[PDB]
Amino acid sequence: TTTLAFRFQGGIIVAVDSRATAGNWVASQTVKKVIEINPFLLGTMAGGVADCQFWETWLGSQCRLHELREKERISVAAASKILSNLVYQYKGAGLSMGTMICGYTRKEGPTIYYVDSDGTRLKGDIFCVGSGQTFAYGVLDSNYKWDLSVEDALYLGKRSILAAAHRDAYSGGSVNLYHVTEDGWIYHGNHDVGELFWKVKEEEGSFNNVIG
């Protein structure tokens, strides 16, 4: 896996790849690694598929129960802490998860929390998670500014996953984009790396290491 999310002037960008592996066997190229918890909350998935898939869908059920009981949408902080407290109870049992809880609320504004299976919970502006996280960081960090436009921010997120998809053997397939605003999350399409790589190479003039 490679997943990222960063905060900027116009909200939050979230980008992920779509590969699943069992050792060197490429098991799938079309896996959904973003989970739509509600119209204002997103969750990213890295590590074990079952672990991530099961518990993040569980998380959504706990978030729905919050708004039924409290007549109000749950905060990003409280949502992330439910998950982190859950995995802490299982600490040592062997769960494998690297997740990011991203969303907007009135009291918090745009917010991102990193949560992993050894109990770490961190608020932050930029995170990259997964086996190809370092490749994504390299492009994202060197091109990041707070004052990026919505159009440029979407591209940088897309371009950072593409970088990791290319270099990391355990990342690839396609890119899934999301933009989170004050009005909620907006889906910005599935982008196959088969076509996207060559399109980016030609138009941008990058990837000169590859035989054109």
Partner: protein, 125 residues
């Protein structure tokens, strides 16, 4: 464990143990709450058949549940301590999990839920 159902219905559809618990409240010292435009005030009566009292150390009638919520009461004094303790613990538990202090409505809903549970549990009044 002591199991007896103490709170039960009567032919006319009343739960006498709950209604007799209201009589204990009627016996208690008066307590009043008034809310203004930008504040709330809690007033409490103290009976004057007790002189030679030490007011420094005597339990106060109004109790802080958290730094932003207070609780007063009327009825059995000993019973009130149990509710106050449970409320204070829940207040700290809420801050721990939700990373935000309780609302007044939430705290009330919790205390009321405890009181209800003691009206249909065996072996308790």
């Amino acid at each position: 464990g002591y199991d007896r159902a103490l709170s039960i219905f009567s032919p006319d559809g009343h739960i006498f143990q709950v209604e007799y618990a209201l009589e204990a409240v009627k016996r208690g010292t008066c307590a009043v709450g008034v809310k203004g435009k930008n504040c709330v005030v809690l007033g409490c009566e103290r009976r004057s058949t007790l002189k030679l009292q030490d007011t420094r150390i005597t339990p106060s009638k109004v109790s802080k549940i958290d730094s932003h919520v207070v609780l007063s009461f009327s009825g059995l004094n000993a019973d009130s301590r149990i509710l106050i303790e449970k409320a204070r613990v829940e207040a700290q538990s809420h801050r721990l999990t939700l990373e935000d202090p309780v609302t007044v409505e939430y705290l009330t809903r919790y205390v009321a839920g405890v009181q209800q549970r003691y009206t249909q549990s065996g072996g308790v009044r």
